[PDB]
Symmetry: C2
Amino acid sequence: NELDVNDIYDHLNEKYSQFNDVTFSKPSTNYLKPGWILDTHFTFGTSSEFYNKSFDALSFNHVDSEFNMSTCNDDSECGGVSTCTAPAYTKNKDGDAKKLCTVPADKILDAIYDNIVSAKRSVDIVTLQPMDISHLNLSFSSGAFTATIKNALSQLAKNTQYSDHHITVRLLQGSFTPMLGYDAESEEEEIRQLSLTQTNYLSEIASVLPEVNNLDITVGSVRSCNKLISNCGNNNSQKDVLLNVAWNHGKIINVDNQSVITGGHNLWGADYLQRNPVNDLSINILGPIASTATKYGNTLWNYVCNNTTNTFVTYANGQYTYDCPAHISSTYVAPTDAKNGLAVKVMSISKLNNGVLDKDADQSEVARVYAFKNATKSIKISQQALFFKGAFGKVLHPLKTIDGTVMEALASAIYKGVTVDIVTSSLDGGIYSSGYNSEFVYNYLLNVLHKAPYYLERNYAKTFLDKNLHINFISINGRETNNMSHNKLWIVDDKVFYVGSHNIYPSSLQQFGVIVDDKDATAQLEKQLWTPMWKNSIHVPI
Amino acid sequence: ELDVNDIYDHLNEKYSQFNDVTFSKPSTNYLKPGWILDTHFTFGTSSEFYNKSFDALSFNHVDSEFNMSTCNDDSECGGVSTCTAPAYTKNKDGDAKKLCTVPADKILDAIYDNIVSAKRSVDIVTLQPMDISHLNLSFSSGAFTATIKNALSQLAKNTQYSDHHITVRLLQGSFTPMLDAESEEEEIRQLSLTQTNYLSEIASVLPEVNNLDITVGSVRSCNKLISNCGNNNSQKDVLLNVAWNHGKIINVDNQSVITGGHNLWGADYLQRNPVNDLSINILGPIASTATKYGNTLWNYVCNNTGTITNTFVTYANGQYTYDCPAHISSTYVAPTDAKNGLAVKVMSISKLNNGVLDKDADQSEVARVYAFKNATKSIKISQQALFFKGAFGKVLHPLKTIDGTVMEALASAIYKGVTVDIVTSSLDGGIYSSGYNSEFVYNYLLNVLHKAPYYLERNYAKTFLDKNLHINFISINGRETNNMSHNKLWIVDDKVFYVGSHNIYPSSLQQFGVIVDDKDATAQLEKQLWTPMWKNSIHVPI
Ligand code: NA
Ligand code: NA
Ligand code: NA
Ligand code: NA
Ligand code: NA
Ligand code: NA
Ligand code: NA
Ligand code: NA
Ligand code: NA
Ligand code: NA
Ligand code: NA
Ligand code: NA
Ligand code: NA
Ligand code: NA
Ligand code: NA
Ligand code: NA
Ligand code: NA
Ligand code: NA
Ligand code: NA
Ligand code: NA
Ligand code: NA
């Protein structure tokens, strides 16, 4: 029989029962409506020259500064794959939308806006802090995501202006930032800079809300470890300076403890929604799984509130305060017509160690090692990278688990005749590089098969690899060799798949994700993303 | 055209207190046939063909000491190899071996020949072998080890009636932290163990009584990670806050010097898929400067003064001692027939800051920046990489000096119409990767031209780059895209060139090198190395 998520949950509950409903959850029924796949990327099968024309403006138009798309009077004025569209997410506080040349990737903005403006109780956003890129300390979001969020909150304020109660809005980012350039001694100044940026972000939001409104907005940063010279809180065998920092890496937009957007997307517009997009995936799902996401948020916010090295501030009732929103209720209440759509079984898995919870609290790695070790037919993987270069050049591999590593599980799968198909970012992907070529991964697996219980002679092992392992890297069209992917995706037996933040390559960052178990949903995901991507990926023969 | 005298005069004006410490007045030195120790696959062939040089027929085998095929006549040797019985295979009982040797083995011939001729001293400075799974190795690996041992055996026989002992120093820069920063005591213990085993291995191939006083030692001058090691950098991050020796020297009798980019790592240069690199073999008063460099380090090792602790041990007169060889006399005495060969002007140039000497003692960067700023016709550069990835992804550029950066100097040369030809390692070169593609370098120099005193509009700056800048990466035949280079080479005006350890990409490691000023010698170097390498390199347009 094929992989059942129930088996994953049973294994975790047997081995880590103290983290049930903390870093994983009993599978529950949730609902996927049309549009639930938020896969953003260039148009597979074309070319970057063609796709990038989608952002060209004719002389009499211009590129909008808020959304970085061309203005627009009808479809004829839009190039590439774009069309003329007046999305609701361009609607500013005075109600006026803009005509822009939009592209399919903007579906993610549609999903964020639509989810936020419907809030009746709470909006809960967890992300990673934008990267430097010279332009001074941005926080929470960049590019079109910022305007989208602002416009959504404006609309939310109008939609709730006669509400009985206030809406809790939480924005939390994992912060890298003392560490980027010099470093571990300077934490005080860094807090000061973060405080300024966060205050300006909140002030900008407040300036597009009515003077009196029912939104209680908190912004904050979290980092759980800055040690560099010693362990952050884990059971790793590997040791490396770059593993000895930690902040949140999970990515969540959770409305009313009901509607969750989660996946690999940071809220960084230039990386996904402009020229030369990075490939990435999130999903939009509704149901009790939101509870688990809410719990994840609560764990981090509790940590921020009872250890404020970190920083936060909230604006409510016309005032800045340090009222800290540590807890949104995780109890699930089905909205009306919640059962609309495709019903699927889903469990959560998280990684909350390295200074937030106890060092044993990494159940995400265990669940994926189990999934790969128990695949019966196939494993499909799409990642940015599978290995990560340590501080002085050491290759760091996916982390050790009571059940071994991902690489050991994949070696077991290959020996047993399970098909393993892998898509990596390109080696020449700049900031989003795979770090290591296909040959490296092939030889790492070869060496795993030389040792361990297998003891295979090298040439004999190559027959297993050559029959069952196929490693490609992402390409828009099978020709370009510098395209980029940020996926954290895997699919077992065309049945069970992961969407979240957790890269296969190692780090100490906290992570959140979900495991869906359903053939119809997996088939939609493969039709929409995996098959096109695979057909256009490039294979470097060994 | 550029004169090395002007470089010396500039250093002496700005840094007179480091005269005869990190630089020297140009002196006349001598280059005999074979002085160019460039090792690489045979340009124009293929990796398949070249690698066949190490295949053994069924009835022969691959020698474990030298990792070459055994051999009866040329017909049993494939690839570009021939059947040869080199002196450096001669073991302590006098028996050489017949092996299938290749041109790159010239470096072994140079080392052996120089060491066995020693009457007073053998001074070896290098970088510790990388820990790729194997042991902690020290000083040398693969064929180099066997060469050194054999040389020392022969040296003992050659000096067995000597009036005085021969001082033999082996010093390696050691990575710190080893494969966390917290365990320095254990680090030293492991280093001591490896050095002891290496010394005992040497002792076991010397006569029981002999006139060789042999010291082995490790040096690291900074392990802080969280703060500056001792420099005037504007850039900061963690990977620059450690330091150890990177200079590479084999100095016999304060007369004969081999120096350049080669570590004594056999598998990286002298087996299949060779990394490209360059050393030279030179005789004359320049050796004095090399001796001084060694003394500076060995003094540091012997007189720690505190903080970081280093380790060494000596074997002499059948006994292990802590007799520390802090000083070999640097006074040059010309050997008989020293003037044999091509007479060339040479100066020394070193980097000894970051914890050994004062923080201002980085004259190597200044020298190269001056040389580039004052090129009048051409700059040829062959490097592994020009930029280096920092701890958390920040790009680290060649370092600031009182005369600017290397990139500022190259931008100036390009604006003035000077041709700049650059050969880089391949991006897909694994351990020896360029780190950044050619486009990155082009765009970095574009940005330099946008700022600074030029303030050039982007498209106008591109005209200078497109006319005068040519960035290629190394290839055996203009097709293979994963070949590797470790060069640290530059040539100005087909006249002045650097050979040594100092990469253009930044680090805090100590460095030694020399600058040769001679048209005939530069022409020999261009004919043997630069021109074939250039002709077989690959250019990625745009
Ligand atoms: Na894409
Ligand atoms: Na309500
Ligand atoms: Na939040
Ligand atoms: Na581990
Ligand atoms: Na954190
Ligand atoms: Na995208
Ligand atoms: Na867009
Ligand atoms: Na995707
Ligand atoms: Na993943
Ligand atoms: Na990560
Ligand atoms: Na996860
Ligand atoms: Na051979
Ligand atoms: Na030495
Ligand atoms: Na600098
Ligand atoms: Na040397
Ligand atoms: Na070589
Ligand atoms: Na060889
Ligand atoms: Na070379
Ligand atoms: Na130099
Ligand atoms: Na330097
Ligand atoms: Na090179």
